[PDB]
Amino acid sequence: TADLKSLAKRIYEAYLKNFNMNKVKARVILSGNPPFVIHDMETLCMAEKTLVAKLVANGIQNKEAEVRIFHCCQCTSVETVTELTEFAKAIPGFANLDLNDQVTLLKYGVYEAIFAMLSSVMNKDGMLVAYGNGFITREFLKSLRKPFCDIMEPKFDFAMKFNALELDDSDISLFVAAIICCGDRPGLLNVGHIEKMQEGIVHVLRLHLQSNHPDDIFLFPKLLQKMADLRQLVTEHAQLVQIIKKTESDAALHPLLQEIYRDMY
């Protein structure tokens, strides 16, 4: 349909406008101001002095390396929350929802969207960081002391299988919109209107995958499963973050993310 093709294009354009990183851009960088490679402690500290200088400008009062990394991770999440919040306005019906339902959908959806989109900047060896200006190796992240090395590998495991689906940005934009439109989120006021909004987005996603990936007749049910996998990945991630919060006094959690996690799992 013209209105359904147009809806898919509108969501794709809103994704291209509101997220600083997209998959085409990420793959250009990942192929080879080129990205500084962080693969050990020396190169981590070098990258920090150039890319987050204030974070390491405190001398002997600088935090432990793992805590500095954790802080950088949190800051990226706060930025993506801002991007996701503006993107959601392109979803038909989202801006017509009650303000409290908009909050609830974004609360439960943002981390599922975050890890879906982080797949775009990950390969089997590492990931882009710092607005495309660093590449940090998967092995270096595994080398961090517990519990910080435990954040990383489950997301790589998810991303490698997600990337094997060979989605492009036109697919991922609709997938992220579908994540945001989940009517079964706890605490929703107008569940019925949200289910209809969801049905509309999922309908556009199904038709789009049919046109864009004629070679994979299971791609839509596969992505439905990936949405469930992401919900579980986020539940587990929240649990690990709570361990870090309780056992690592220096790993302070940003207030916006504290509110997202609050009463989640």
Ligand X SMILES: CCCCOc1ccc(C[C@H](CC)C(=O)O)cc1CNC(=O)c1ccc2ccc3cccc4ccc1c2c34
Residues within the interface to a copy of itself (CB under 8 A): 17, 20, 33, 50-55, 57, 75, 79, 130-134, 157, 161, 206-207, 210, 214, 217-218, 220-222, 224-225, 227-228
Of residues 121 through 140, those in contact with ligand X by CB under 6 A are: 127, 129-130, 134, 136
Residue 74 near which of ligand X, a copy of itself, none (CB within 5-8 Å, type-dependent): ligand X
Q: Which residue has the tokens 């916006």?
A: 256
CA 227 to chain centre: 12
Instruction: Report how far apart the first and last C-alpha atoms of the chain are (Å, whole number).
Output: 40
Q: Quote the CA–CA distance of 140 and 143 in Å, as a whole number.
A: 5
Structure tokens at 232: 């579980």
In the complex, the smallest distance separating the C-beta of residue 132 from ligand X, rounded to whole angstroms, is 10
Q: Is 131 annotated as a binding residue?
A: no
Residues 6 or more apart whose CB falls under 8 angstroms from that of 190 comprise: 97, 98, 101
In the complex, the smallest distance separating the C-beta of residue 246 from a copy of itself, rounded to whole angstroms, is 25
Of residues 133 through 192, those in contact with ligand X by CB under 6 A are: 134, 136, 151-152, 155-156
Structure tokens at 97: 């929802």
> 185-213 burial string, b = 16+ CB within 10 Å, else e?
beebeeeebbeebbebbbebbbbbbeebb
Q: Quote the CA–CA distance of 94 and 89 in Å, as a whole number.
A: 6
- By the rule CB under 6 A, 21 interacts with ligand X: no
Q: Is 211 annotated as a binding residue?
A: no
- By the rule CB under 6 A, 209 interacts with ligand X: no
Q: Is 12 annotated as a binding residue?
A: no
**130 vs 197, beta carbon nearer ligand X:** 130
Please state the residue numbers annotated as binding site for indeglitazar.
77, 111, 261
Contacts to ligand X by CB under 6 A: 38, 47-48, 51-52, 69-70, 72-74, 76-77, 118, 127, 129-130, 134, 136, 151-152, 155-156, 241, 257
